[PDB]
Design a protein around this ligand. Structure first.
Ligand SMILES: [Ca+2]
Length: 328
């Protein structure tokens, strides 16, 4: 009987967990809530993230991962244990093979601590890899070839970019300008320009429905509702795709600067791959309309949007099961 394979994409806003033979058992916010002063779990994932607004006083909300940052290693273990509890199987960790994908900001100390933590839970083997390496494999890139792979992952709380060659990361950097920032900046733009406060969900909907980085085949506008800034009264206004496009382009100056920084670090041996093969784009924001065209216009290299951008990291972990088992 083979050892169970467990993959955890720690993620930047949501975590995703996969168990061999079960599939993906967790995919939502990296948040948990307890009755105050206890470890009595009242909500996990989305059910807990909702309450961040005004939590019931007899309830404490914990955020083990804030934009991909580990807030506390003991709190991170609680969260990992809650994920494994989803399997509803006694001793899910015993003798298992565990792969954890994490942002590069997770220090070597924290990665080694998570290895000891999972081994203490019962794992036979624990391996920690960077999310950009797994995202490229999940999105369909041959990360094991000596050819240069150039990856950009726009998630919820981090945007990362890197160069991959021969199964490993050659260089990678990350910034804080990502999906959550974009939603909040849409909110702030509409408050300043239309004197109405919208909720985060309306901001996300604006992004999805009419947001773009490049002038497409359809001109759209949108009716939205929010709180009038002066009076507080519910108020309606129309938002044009052109003003949101201008806003998104301004935000993405940070993301094109990140790609420029990575491209400026390309070794001479891989420069041809950058020019001829170009960029692969994954993450939740990879589906912003016109992103391919916007990036191709700026960098004059090919850009490819991943087929599975929302799940590239965990899909790569799932594909990486063979490599771990093979090399064993
Ligand atoms: Ca800017």
């Amino acid at each position: 009987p083979p050892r169970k394979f467990i993959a955890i994409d720690l993620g930047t806003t949501n975590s995703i967990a996969y168990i061999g033979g079960r599939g993906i058992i967790y995919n939502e916010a990296s948040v948990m809530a307890y009755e105050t002063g206890t470890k009595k779990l009242v909500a996990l994932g989305e059910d807990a993230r909702k309450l961040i607004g005004k939590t019931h006083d007899k309830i404490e909300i914990y955020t083990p991962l804030r934009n991909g940052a580990i807030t506390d290693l003991r709190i991170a273990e609680e969260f990992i244990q809650h994920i494994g509890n989803r399997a509803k199987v006694q001793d899910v960790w015993k003798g298992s093979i565990v792969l954890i994908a994490c942002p590069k900001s997770v220090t070597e100390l924290e990665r080694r601590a998570m290895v000891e933590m999972c081994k203490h839970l019962g794992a036979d083997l624990v391996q920690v890899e960077e999310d950009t390496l797994m995202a490229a494999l999940g999105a369909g890139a041959n990360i094991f070839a000596p050819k240069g792979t150039f990856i950009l992952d726009i998630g919820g709380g981090k945007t990362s970019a890197g160069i991959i060659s021969a199964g490993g990361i050659v260089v990678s950097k990350s910034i804080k300008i990502a999906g959550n920032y974009i939603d909040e900046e849409i909110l702030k733009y509409i408050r300043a320009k239309h004197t109405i406060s919208i909720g985060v969900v309306t901001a996300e909907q604006i992004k999805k429905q009419i947001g773009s980085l490049y002038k497409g085949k359809e001109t759209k506008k949108m009716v939205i509702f929010g709180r009038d800034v002066v009076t507080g009264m519910p108020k309606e206004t129309e938002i044009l795709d052109s003003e949101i496009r201008k806003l998104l382009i301004s935000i993405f100056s940070s993301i094109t600067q990140l790609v420029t920084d990575i491209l400026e670090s390309t070794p001479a041996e891989l420069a041809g791959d950058a020019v001829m093969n170009g960029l692969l784009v994954s993450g939740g924001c990879a589906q912003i309309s016109g992103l391919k065209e916007f990036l191709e216009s700026y960098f004059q290299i090919p850009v490819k949007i991943a087929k599975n951008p929302q799940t590239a990291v965990i899909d790569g972990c799932i594909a990486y099961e063979k490599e771990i088992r093979d090399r064993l």
